[PDB]
From a paper:
To understand the structural properties of the NTase region of mammalian GLD-2s, we determined crystal structures of rnGLD-2131-484 and mmGLD-2143-484 at resolution of 2.5 Å, and 2.7 Å with Rfree of 24.3% and 27.1%, respectively. The cleft harbours the conserved catalytic residues Asp213 and Asp215 on β2, and Asp279 (substituted by an alanine in the structural model) on β5. Structural comparison with other PAPs containing wild-type catalytic residues indicated that mutation of Asp279 does not affect global or local folding of rnGLD-2. In rnGLD-2, β9 stays closest to the active site, and the overall topology of the β6−β9 sheet is homologous to the yeast GLD-2-related protein Cid1.
Germline development defective 2 (GLD-2) is among the first reported cytoplasmic non-canonical PAPs that promotes the translation of germline-specific mRNAs by extending their short poly(A) tails in metazoan, such as Caenorhabditis elegans and Xenopus. GLD-2 proteins from different species have various lengths, but share a conserved nucleotidyltransferase (NTase) region composed of a catalytic domain and a central domain. Whereas C. elegans GLD-2 prefers adenosine-rich RNA substrates, mammalian GLD-2 can work on RNA oligos with various sequences.
Numbering used by the authors: 148 to 221, 231 to 481
Amino acid sequence: TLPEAKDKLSQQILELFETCQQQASDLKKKELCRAQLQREIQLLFPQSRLFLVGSSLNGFGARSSDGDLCLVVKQKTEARHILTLVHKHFCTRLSGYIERPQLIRAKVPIVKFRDKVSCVEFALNVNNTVGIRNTFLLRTYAYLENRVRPLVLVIKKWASHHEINDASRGTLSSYSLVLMVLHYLQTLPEPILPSLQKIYPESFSTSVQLHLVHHAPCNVPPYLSKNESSLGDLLLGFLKYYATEFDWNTQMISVREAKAIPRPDDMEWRNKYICVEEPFDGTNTARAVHEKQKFDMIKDQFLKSWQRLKNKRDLNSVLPLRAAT
């Protein structure tokens, strides 16, 4: 299943999609690593399970997507004690096939490591279960329509190429972008995506047992929309929408509502530049964008890329196609 591709830009977007999309063999090496590590971690926490989460499973992965793992142990004092124990385990016992494990310090503490078996970089956290839930929310969107995945992928590569796709460095997280693409698709005049949580709350409710949340994409049917915009029309529109129309200073993006909502007067959103509502809990995913200079970098790059693309409808105007493939 693939979109139209009547023009050059749309064809280049599909070409980039098909050569960079995460292949089944990439996902098998990540799953073999996940199962081996769960087995390995269970020596320490026998009541624990290890989940693949994020780009590896949400449908928006590229061959270069790192792996995200979520360790479920039956509030943060425990989460940090477990993460440091797991880390010492990786350093002492697992050093034969687990390279350079490091505790990275962030809102969600992480153990970063490289699997020498798959040669793949991984990020493991402890008990951040919301990432399991939204993995399968996003996955259900990722396959709800054939344009969502090519658009999201070219947009991820685009943001990464322009050094605005790294929340650790002050810019937009991949999750923020994905939510922004999905919001753009949700609010078109003839919309390309509905709200999954409004139409089927039963398949994404917070009472669903974590180990069954992945059943949700098997339940939800595909979305047929009236919009006939091709991939190049939509990539241009997505750059224009955030470059010109979307008021960062007054509104927040709610994929849960499939709407733009006014910024709440709560203290979380009081001084933030960018407000994207996490769909399961109520928090700002773009909270990492807190420096004016970086905020401007995002704004200026949206404007500029929409300009170069408008004039020359070649994907090379905003993303060198030789630097990805």
